[PDB]
C-alpha cells in the first residue's frame, strides 16, 4: 500500500533526512532535517497523500510543507514539496520544491525559489 510504502525514513540528493508517517486516510506527519540552507536540527513536517492511488502503474501523489522555524533557528521561510511516491525495490519520492521567504512587497518578485528533490530509502 502507499500507506505502508511511504511511512519511514527518506534521504535526498543533498543529504537531508525526511522522517514521515502516512496515516490511513491521507495524513503525512513527521520531521525534516535539511543539510543545506538557513537550517539546523529538525523541523516539523505536515502534508497529505492520495490514500487510494491508481493501480495501473502510476505513482502516488503527495505533498508536504516545512516552515523553517524550530528552537534553534528561524529563517522566516517555508518550503512545500509536491511530487509522487513510486514503490518497489528502488522506491522513490520524486518532488518539485517551492521555498518562499518573507519579503517586503517591493522584493516579492524574488521571494520564491524553485528546485527539485529526489528521495530514496538508502543514504
Amino acid at each position: 500500500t502507499a500507506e505502508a510504502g511511504i511511512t519511514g525514513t527518506w534521504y535526498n540528493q543533498l543529504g537531508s533526512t525526511l522522517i514521515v508517517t502516512a496515516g490511513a486516510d491521507g495524513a503525512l506527519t513527521g520531521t525534516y532535517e535539511s543539510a543545506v540552507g538557513n537550517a539546523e536540527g529538525s523541523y516539523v513536517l505536515t502534508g497529505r497523500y492520495d490514500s487510494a492511488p491508481a493501480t495501473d502503474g502510476s505513482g502516488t501523489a503527495l505533498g508536504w510543507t516545512v516552515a523553517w522555524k524550530n528552537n534553534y533557528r528561524n529563517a522566516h521561510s517555508a518550503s512545500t514539496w509536491s511530487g509522487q511516491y513510486v514503490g518497489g525495490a528502488e522506491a522513490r519520492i520524486n518532488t518539485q520544491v517551492l521555498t518562499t521567504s518573507g519579503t517586503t512587497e517591493a522584493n516579492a518578485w524574488k521571494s520564491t525559489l524553485v528546485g527539485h528533490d529526489t528521495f530514496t530509502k538508502v543514504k
Side-chain angles (χ1 to χ4, degrees), residues 40-57:
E40 103 185 275
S42 94
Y43 298 85
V44 174
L45 175 158
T46 187
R48 304 290 295 168
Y49 75 105
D50 176 6
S51 49
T55 56
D56 58 358

Side-chain angles (χ1 to χ4, degrees), residues 54 61 86 98 100 103 109:
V86 175
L98 301 177
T100 300
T103 66
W109 69 273

